[PDB]
Amino acid sequence: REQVKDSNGNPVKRGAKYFIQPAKSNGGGLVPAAINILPFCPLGITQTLLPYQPGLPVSFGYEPVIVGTDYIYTSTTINIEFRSEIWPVCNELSKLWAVDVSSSAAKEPAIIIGGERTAPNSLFKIEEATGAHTYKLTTSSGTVGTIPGPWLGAPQLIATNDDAKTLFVKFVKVD
Amino acid sequence: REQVKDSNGNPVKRGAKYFIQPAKSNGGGLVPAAINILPFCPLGITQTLLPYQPGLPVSFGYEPVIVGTDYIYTSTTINIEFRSEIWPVCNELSKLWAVDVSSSAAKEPAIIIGGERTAPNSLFKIEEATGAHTYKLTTSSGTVGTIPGPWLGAPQLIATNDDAKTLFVKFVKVD
Amino acid sequence: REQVKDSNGNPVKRGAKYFIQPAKSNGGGLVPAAINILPFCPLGITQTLLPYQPGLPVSFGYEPVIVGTDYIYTSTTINIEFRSEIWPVCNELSKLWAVDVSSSAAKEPAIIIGGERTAPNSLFKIEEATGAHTYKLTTSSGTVGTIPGPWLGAPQLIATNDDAKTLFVKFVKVD
Amino acid sequence: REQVKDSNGNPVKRGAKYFIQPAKSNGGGLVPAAINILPFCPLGITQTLLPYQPGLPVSFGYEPVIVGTDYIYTSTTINIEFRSEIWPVCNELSKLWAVDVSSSAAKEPAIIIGGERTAPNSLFKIEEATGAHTYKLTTSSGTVGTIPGPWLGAPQLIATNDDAKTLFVKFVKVD
Ligand code: CHL
Ligand code: CHL
Ligand code: CHL
Ligand code: CHL
C-alpha cells in the first residue's frame, strides 16, 4: 500500500477535488453522460472525446471509514463522487460512482452514478500501473475498463475481467 | 404462396399504405426511432408503447420485380418502406427497412431504415402465422423479432433465430 | 350555452376520452411536447405535424363542480387533462392543461401541462365557432391560439388576444 | 487601434487558438449549443455554466484580408471560428460565428455558427472595455450580449443595442 500521487507527484488528499484523466490519450477527462435514452437515470461515465475538457471533478473518501490520515492509499476501498454545484438531472440519485447491479445489468456492467455510500457496488480501489503517476481502478465486479459507447464511440466505463479494456488514469488536482 | 390479407380480410395491394400493427398487444404500430444516441442515423424501428398511435405508414413492393399482379404474396421477397412527407433527420438515407450489416452490427442485428433497393439486407418476406390475418416477417439474417429497446423497453426490431422473440403483426389499411 | 358536440354530432360526456383535433388541417391531434430544452418540465402542447397521429386523449370535467349533468356545455369553466397510462417525464406535475403564469411567462403565454385543479390558470371554456362541430378554447389569459413552435414550426399552443392565431378544434371520441 | 491582449498580457496572434472567457463570472468559456430543438442547425453560442470548462477554442483572422501583421488589432473586422477536430452535427455549415439574418431572426438576433467568410453578418470587431485585458465584441447588428437561454438560463449570445446585456470577455491562450 502506498500513497496515491496526483499528476504533479503530490499525494492525493481525502475530499479534495481531482479530475480523472485517461493516460496516453487525446481525449479529456471522465464525465457524466447518459448510457440509456429513456429513462436516462442513472447516468453512466464516459471519457469526453474533446481534447481540452478536463473532466468533471471528483473527490475520494475512505469507506469503510479510516480515521487519522488525510491521504488516499492504494488497495483500500473508497467511494468516488462527482463534485458539481450544477446537477440538473437524476437528482433523486447520489453522485457516487457504482457498478450497475440492477436486473438489466450487462454481463460486463456499466459504471453508473447514484450508488449508496455503504453498498458493496460502490466500493473502488486505486491500484498502481506502469507509467509515472498512472493508476487503475478496481471493484468487486472486475477492473474498470471502457468499451466504445453511444457518444461517437467515446470510451464508456464498465467493470470487466478483460485486461485489454483496462482504463489507465492519472488524477489531476483541480487548481 | 397466398395473398397476404389486411386486418379487414382484403388483399394487400402493392404500393398502398399500411400500418404494421403487432398482434395481441396493448401498444400501437411500428415507427422509426433512434437506437443510438450519436450518430442517431440510421434510425431503428420500434413498437410505440402508446395505445392509439397506429404507426407510421409503410408500402410493400416486389424486389426483384414481379410484373403483372397488384397483390402481395407470401414467401416472396419485397422491400418495406416508410411513407412520410415529413422526414427531418437521416435524409441522406432512404426509408426502406434493412438488416444492419455494418461492422458494429449486433449478433442479433437491428432492423434499421436506409437500405438499398437491391441489396440483400433489404429483402423481407411475409409468412403466415396462426391467428386471423396474423403474419411474421423474415429476412436472410433471421426472423424479425423484438427485444426491449432504449425507449422504456419498447419492442425494438431485430433479426433473430430465437423463435420466442418473433414479432407477429397485422397490416391495417391506412384509411 | 349548448351541449358541446363531438365530431360525430354526439354530445361530449364528462370524463370520457377525446382527441382534440385542429379543424381544416393536414396535421394530427394535440399532444404533449417540450417547449424548453432544460428544464423540459413543464411540457407544452403542440399539434403534431404527422397526418394520421390522432393526438393524446383528453377528458373534460367541470371546475368548479357542476353536479347533475353528464354533458359538457359551452361557456362553462372546465379542466382539460391528458389521459395516459405511460407518462415518463414531468411526473411531479399533473396532466391538467394550464396557462403558464410563472415569472418567465411569455407576453403571449404558453399553454403548459401541470396545472392545479382549482387554480385560475387551469380554467378553460369551449366556445362555438363556425363550421360543423368546430369550437374554440378560451382562458382568462386570452383565447387559445398557436404560433410556429420549436418542432419544425409545428403549431404551439398559447393564450392570445390576436384573433388571427385562434385554434379551431373538433373533439374526436376515442373509440 | 491597439493590439488585443490575451489574459497573460501577450498580444493575440492571427490563427492561434484562444478560449473566449466571460469576465467576472463563475461559469466557463463560450461553446456551441443548440438554440432550437428541430432543426438544431445552425447552432448558437452559449456560456457554459460549469466552472472549469474552458470553452471550445476559437481563432481570429482578418476579413477583409490585412497582409503584413501577425497580430489582431481592435476596431478591425475579423471572422471568429470554432476550432474542433470533432464536429458531429451541422456539418453542411461552417464553424465561423455570424449574426442570424434568416427570416426567423429575433429582434435581438442570435449569434449562430455557420457564417460565410465574406458575408457582412460574419464580421466582428474586438473593442476595449474597462478591466485588465477585458474586451467587448461588436457586429453591424449591434453589440454582442447575452440573454438567459434554453440551457438552465445559461448566457446565450445575441446582438443587441442594450448596453446592460453586453458580454465582457477575455481571451485565454490555449496551452
Ligand atoms: C441528460 C444527462 C446527460 C447527458 C445526455 C450528458 C452527455 C454528455 N456529457 Mg455530461 N451528460 C449528462 C449529464 C451531466 N453531464 C455533466 C457534466 C459533463 C461535463 C463537464 C462534460 C460532460 C460531457 C458529456 C458528453 C460526453 C461525450 C462526448 O464526448 O461527446 C462530445 C460530443 C459533442 C460535443 C457533440 C454534441 C453533444 C451535445 C452536447 C449533445 C447532443 C445531443 C444529441 C443531439 C441528442 C440525440 C438524441 C437521440 C436520442 C436521437 C455527453 C454529450 C462532456 C462533453 O463533451 O460536453 C461537450 C464534458 O466535458 N458532461 C453533469 C454535471 C453538471 C451532468 C448532470 O446531470
Ligand atoms: C431523431 C430521430 C427520432 C427519434 C429519437 C424518434 C423517437 C421516437 N419515435 Mg419516431 N423518432 C425519430 C424519427 C422519426 N420518427 C418518425 C415517426 C414516428 C411516429 C408516427 C411515432 C414515432 C414514435 C417514436 C417513439 C417510439 C418509442 C415510444 O414508445 O416512446 C413513447 C415515449 C414518450 C411519448 C415519452 C416522450 C418521448 C419524446 C417524444 C422524446 C423524449 C426525448 C428524450 C427526453 C431525450 C433523452 C436524451 C437522452 C440521450 C439523455 C420515440 C420517442 C412514436 C411515439 O410514441 O411518439 C410519441 C410514434 O407514434 N415516430 C419519423 C417520421 C416523421 C421520423 C423521422 O425522422
Ligand atoms: C421529453 C418530453 C417530450 C418531448 C421532447 C416530446 C416531443 C414530442 N411529442 Mg410528446 N413529447 C414529450 C412528452 C410526451 N409526449 C407524449 C405523447 C405524445 C404523442 C401521442 C405524440 C407526441 C408527439 C410529440 C412531438 C410533436 C411535434 C412534431 O410534430 O414532430 C414530429 C417530428 C418527428 C416525428 C421527428 C422526430 C421527433 C423525435 C421523436 C424527437 C427528435 C429528438 C431531437 C433529435 C432532439 C434534439 C435535441 C436538441 C436540443 C439538440 C414531439 C417530438 C407527436 C409525434 O409526432 O411523435 C412522433 C405525437 O403524436 N407526444 C407523452 C405521453 C406518453 C409524453 C409524456 O411525457
Ligand atoms: C447537438 C448539438 C449540440 C447541443 C445540443 C449542444 C449543447 C451544449 N453544449 Mg455544445 N452542443 C452541441 C454541439 C457542440 N457542442 C460542442 C462543444 C461543446 C463544449 C466544449 C461544451 C459544450 C457545452 C454545451 C452545453 C452548454 C450549456 C450548459 O451550460 O449546460 C450544462 C448542462 C449540463 C451539463 C447538463 C447535461 C447536459 C447534457 C450534455 C445534454 C442534456 C440533453 C437534454 C436532456 C435533452 C433534452 C431534450 C429536450 C428537447 C426534451 C450544452 C449542453 C458545454 C457543457 O457544459 O457540456 C457539458 C461545454 O463545455 N459544447 C461541439 C464541438 C465538438 C459541438 C458540435 O456540434
Numbering used by the authors:
A (entry chain A), B (entry chain A), C (entry chain A), D (entry chain A): 1 to 175
Provide text from the study:
To this end, we coupled a crystallographic approach, solving the still missing Chl b-reconstituted wt structures (Chl b Lv-wt and Chl b Bo-wt), to a Raman investigation focused on the carbonyl groups, with the aim to characterize the (possible) H-bond in which the carbonyl may be involved.
The 2 amino acids-longer motif (-PVCNEL-) found in Bo-wt at the corresponding position does not lead to a preference for either Chl a or Chl b. Bo-wt also has a proline residue in the binding pocket, close to ring B, but the residue conformation is not affected by the binding of Chl b and a water molecule, as it retains its endo-conformation. Additionally, the Raman characterization proved to be fundamental also in the case also of Bo-wt, as it allowed to reveal the presence of an H-bond partner for the bound Chl b, not discernible in the crystallographic structure due to the flexibility of the binding site. Accordingly, when the surrounding of ring B is less hindered, like in Bo-wt, there is little or no selectivity.
